[PDB]
Subunit: 306 residues, 3 copies
C-alpha cells in the first residue's frame, strides 16, 4: 500500500516545472528545464496514480481508515492537487487532455472537502491534537490549485471564487494551528509536516498572480512579506524539525518552495524586488534539488517504498 | 414572552425584499414582489416590536437573563438589525422615517455591542461552550447592516467604518468557532443555528457592494468564493442539522440566503458569473419560500408562539 | 534593573512627535510641538538605552529570564521599535544617523522574532495562560514600525513586505487572544496591557498610509472602523482595567493612541471623515498628556524607578 503522502513528490516537481516555464521568454533555456521537470513529475504521478488504484482495489480498508481519520484524510487531497498540476504541465502540449485533468482534479477536490472537511463540524472525532499543518492541503492548497488551473483555461472569475475559498480558509485555520503549535509539542513523527506551514502565503500569491495576469500589486507584496517571515521562522526551526534525522517527509516543504520559485518569476518580470526574487528562485531550486538527491539516495538503498 | 430569535423572520423577509428591489430596472415586475415582501416584513416587525415592548414591561427579568447570558445575548441584536432593514425598505416611500429607523438601529446596535460584547473580555462568564454561531449577530451582521443602511443615506465613508468593523470582527471570530465546532458536537437544541455560518461572507459582500456602488471587483469575487464553499459544506451537513426534525430555528439560514439573493443581483448587473447569480437568486428564494410555508404550517397548528 | 516595559514611554512620545510632524504644512506651529516631543522622546530613549546596557552588563541573568519567558520576552521588542521611531524623528535633522538607527532596529526586531517567536512553535513552554496582548509587540508592532521606517528611507516595496508580515501576523494572533480574554479573566497585575489591544488596527493603518503615500482608500477606512470599534470596547472596559488603581502600565495605551493621532492627520489631509479625525487627534493627545502628567507625578514621589 503506497503511502498517500508520497504524492507530495510529483506535486513539488510539477509546481517547479511550472515556475521554470514562466521564465522561458526571459531565458529560453528555461523551457528545456521546465519540460524535463514536467515529464519527470508526470511520469511519477502516473506511477503513483496506478499504485493508488491498486491500493483502492486490494487495500480498500486502508484507504477507508485514512479517509475517516481526522488527521490522515488530508493527504488524499494531494491526489486531485497533483492531477491539476500535471494538467497544467500538459497544457503546453495538449490543451484538451490538460483541461480534462484540470476539471477532474477540481471537481474531485471540491467534492472531497465538501464531504470530509464539513463532516468535522459534527464534532467528537477531530480532537485538539488533530490540529496539524496537513489540514492546509484540502482546505487551502487544493482551492488555490483549482484557482490557478481554471485561470489557465480562461475561467478567471471562477478562478477568483476558488482563490477566495482558499485564502479565507487559510486565514481562518492558521490562527488555531499556530496556537496549537505554541502549546503542544508536535510529535517528532509528524514534525516534517511543519514544512507545510511555509506553503500558504506562497501558494496564495502564486495563484493570485496566475489569475490577475501577473500584476504584482499591494496584495502580492503583502503576501510575500508574511511568506518570508514564515520562511525565516522555519529556517530557525529546521534543526528541531529534523532532530530525529532527515526523512522523505521533508517533501512537505516542496509545496511552499515551488510556489516561492513560481511567484519569484512574476516579481522578477514585474521588476519588483528583483534581488529577493533571484534569491528566492535559486534557494527554492537548491532545496528541491537536495530533496531529489536525498530521494534518489533512499531509492538507492531500498528505503523508499514501505 | 416572545422568543427573541423570532426577529430572524422579519430579518430574512426584509433582506429578501431589498434583493428584489435591486432587480426592478432589469425586470419591472420585481418591484411588486419587493413591495409585497417589504410590507409583510414590516408588518411582522411592528408586531414583534410591540410584543418585545410587552416583554420588557411585564417579563423584564426574562430580558435581563437573556441579556446577561454569554450565549443568548446575541439574539437581541436582531432587534436593531431588523429596525435598520425595515428603514431600508421604507426609504422607497418615506426617506425621513427611514432615516430615523436607520439611526436608531445603528446607535442601538453599536451601544449594544459596546456594552455587552466588550464585557465578555472580563473573563469568567463566557465559556468554551459559549462559542456559538449566534455571536455573529451582534459582532458582524449588525455592523454590516449599519454599513449598508448608512450608504443608502449617502454616508459612504461612515459606512466603510462599520463595514470594516464587521469584516475584521468576522475574520477574528470564525477561526475559534470552526475549531470549536470540529472538537465539540453542537447540541441538537442549538444545531439550527449552524445556518448562521452561511451568513458572514454573503452579508459582507452585500454590504460591500452597497457601499462601493455595486462594483463587482476582486474582493467581491473572493467573498463569494468562500461564501459558496460554506454553502456546500452546510448543504452536506443539512441532514445532520435537522437530525431531530425540522423546526422554526431554521430561519437562521435566512440571513445568508437573503444576502446570497441580494449579492446575486449585483453580480448579475455587473455581468460577472451570471449563471451562478441566477442559481443563487432562485435557490435562495425557493429556500426562504420553504421557510415561509413551514412557518404558515406551524401557525396553522398553534405551534408558533410559545 | 530597568523594567523593560518602560520603553513604552519613549515609544508613545516618539510616535506622537511624528503625528504632529505630519501636520506642519497645515499648521506651521505643529512643527515646534513635534520637535519638542521628538527631543524629549529621544532624550528618554537615550537614557533607557544606557540603563538597559547597564542591565545587560550587571544584571544579565535578569535579561536572560525575561528573554526565555513566553510572556515577558515580548517587551524586549520595544527596544528596536523605539530605536526605529527615534530614527524617524532624527531624519528631519540628520538622515544618515536616522538611517543607521532604522536599519539597526529593523535587523534587530527581525532577528529577535526569528529567534524567539518561532521557538514558541516547539511547544511545551508557552501555555494557554501566556496568550497576552503583549505578544503584539514583537509579532505585529515591530513589523509595522519597520514598514513605515523603510518607507521613510524610500524602500517602499521592502516596506510592504514588513507591512504584510505585521498585518497577517495580527489577524492570525488576535482570534486566539480575544477567545482567551473571553474565557480567562486576565489577572489585574496584567490588566493595563489590555491597552495594547487598541494598537493593531491603528498601527496598521498608520504604517499603510506611510507606505502608500497617504492615500486614504478602502483598506484604510476598513482598518479605522475596526480600530474605533476596539476603542469603544476598551473605553467601556476602562473602569475594570483600572479596578486596582491607575498605574504606569497604562502607557500600554499610548501605542494605539499615538497611531490614532498619526493616522488622523492623513484622513484629515485626504478630506475623509475630518470630524472624526479632529476628535481622534484631540482625544489621543489629551490621553497621552494625562499619561505624562501621571508620570511626572510618580517621578515626583520616587515611584517611577523600581
Ligand atoms: C480516495 C477516496 C477514498 C474514499 C473512501 C470512502 C470511505 C467509505 O466510507 C464508508 O462508506 C460506507 C459505505 O460506502 C459506510 O458504511 C462506511 O461506514 C464508511 O466507512
Ligand atoms: C480523490 C478524492 C475524491 C473524493 C472521494 C470521496 C468519496 C467519499 O465517500 C463517502 O464518504 C462520506 C463521508 O464523509 C459519505 O458520503 C459516505 O461515507 C461515502 O459514500
Ligand atoms: C489579509 C490581507 C489582506 C490585504 C489586503 C490588501 C489590500 C489591497 O490593497 C489595495 O490594493 C490595490 C492594488 O495595489 C490598491 O490600489 C489599493 O489602493 C490597495 O488598498
Ligand atoms: C525569478 C528570478 C529568475 C530571474 C533570474 C535572472 C537573473 C539574471 O541576472 C541579471 O541579468 C540581468 C539582465 O538580463 C542583469 O542586468 C542583472 O544585473 C543580472 O543580475
Ligand atoms: C433590550 C435590552 C435589554 C437590556 C437589559 C439590561 C439588563 C440590566 O442589568 C442589570 O442592571 C442593573 C441595574 O440597572 C444591575 O444592578 C443588575 O445587576 C443588572 O442585572
Ligand atoms: C436593543 C439594544 C439596545 C441596547 C440596550 C443595552 C442596555 C444595557 O444595560 C446595561 O447593562 C450593562 C451591562 O453590560 C451595564 O451598563 C448595566 O448593566 C446596564 O445599565
Ligand atoms: C480576507 C480577504 C482579503 C482579500 C483582499 C482582496 C484584495 C483586493 O484586491 C485588490 O482589489 C482591487 C479591486 O479589484 C484590485 O485592483 C487590486 O489590484 C487587488 O489587489
Ligand atoms: C440575480 C439574478 C436575477 C436575474 C435573472 C435574469 C434571468 C433572465 O434570463 C436571461 O434573460 C436574458 C435577457 O434578459 C437572456 O439573454 C438570457 O439567456 C436568460 O438567461
Ligand atoms: C536583549 C536581548 C537579550 C538576549 C538574551 C539571550 C539569552 C541567552 O540564552 C542562553 O544562551 C546560552 C548560551 O549563550 C544558553 O546556554 C542558555 O541556556 C541560554 O539561556
Ligand atoms: C534587541 C533584540 C535583538 C535580538 C537579540 C537576541 C539574541 C538571542 O540569543 C540567542 O537565544 C536563542 C534562543 O531563542 C538562541 O540562539 C540562543 O539561545 C542565543 O544565542
Ligand atoms: C482583513 C481586511 C481586508 C480588507 C481588504 C480591503 C480590500 C481593499 O479593497 C480594494 O481597495 C481598492 C482601493 O480603494 C479598491 O479600488 C478596490 O476596488 C477595493 O476592493
Ligand atoms: C488630524 C486633525 C488635525 C487637524 C485639525 C484642524 C482643525 C481646524 O479646524 C478647522 O479649520 C478649517 C480651516 O483651516 C475650518 O474650515 C474648519 O471649520 C475648522 O473645523
Amino acid at each position: 500500500p503506497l503511502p498517500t503522502g508520497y504524492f507530495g513528490i510529483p506535486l513539488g516537481l510539477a509546481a517547479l516545472s511550472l515556475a521554470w516555464f514562466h521564465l522561458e521568454n526571459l531565458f529560453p533555456a528555461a523551457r528545456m528545464v521546465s519540460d524535463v521537470l514536467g515529464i519527470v513529475a508526470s511520469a511519477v504521478w502516473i506511477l503513483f496514480i496506478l499504485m493508488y488504484a491498486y491500493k483502492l482495489r486490494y487495500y480498500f480498508e486502508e484507504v477507508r481508515a485514512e479517509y475517516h481519520s481526522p488527521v490522515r484524510f488530508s493527504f488524499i487531497a494531494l491526489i486531485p492537487i497533483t492531477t491539476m498540476l500535471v494538467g497544467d504541465i500538459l497544457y503546453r502540449w495538449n490543451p484538451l487532455i490538460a483541461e480534462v485533468l484540470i476539471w477532474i482534479g477540481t471537481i474531485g477536490q471540491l467534492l472531497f472537502s465538501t464531504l470530509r472537511v464539513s463532516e468535522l463540524w459534527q464534532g467528537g472525532v477531530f480532537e485538539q491534537k488533530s490540529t496539524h499543518p496537513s489540514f492546509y492541503l484540502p482546505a487551502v492548497a487544493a482551492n488555490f490549485t483549482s484557482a490557478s488551473s481554471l485561470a489557465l483555461l480562461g475561467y478567471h472569475d471562477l478562478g477568483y471564487l476558488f482563490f477566495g475559498a482558499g485564502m479565507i480558509a487559510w486565514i481562518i485555520f492558521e490562527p488555531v494551528l499556530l496556537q496549537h503549535l505554541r502549546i503542544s509539542s508536535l510529535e517528532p513523527q509528524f514534525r516534517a509536516t511543519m514544512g507545510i506551514v511555509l506553503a500558504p502565503a506562497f501558494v496564495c500569491v502564486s495563484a493570485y498572480l496566475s489569475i490577475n495576469h501577473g500584476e504584482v500589486d499591494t496584495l502580492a507584496k503583502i503576501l510575500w512579506g508574511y511568506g518570508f517571515l514564515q520562511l525565516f521562522f522555519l529556517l530557525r526551526l529546521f534543526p528541531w524539525i529534523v532532530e530525529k534525522g532527515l526523512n522523505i517527509g521533508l517533501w512537505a516543504f516542496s509545496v511552499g518552495l515551488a510556489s516561492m520559485a513560481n511567484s519569484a518569476t512574476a516579481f522578477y518580470h514585474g521588476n519588483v524586488l528583483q534581488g529577493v526574487s533571484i534569491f528566492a528562485f535559486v534557494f527554492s531550486n537548491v532545496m528541491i534539488g537536495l530533496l531529489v538527491l536525498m530521494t534518489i539516495y533512499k531509492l538507492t538503498k531500498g528505503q523508499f517504498f514501505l
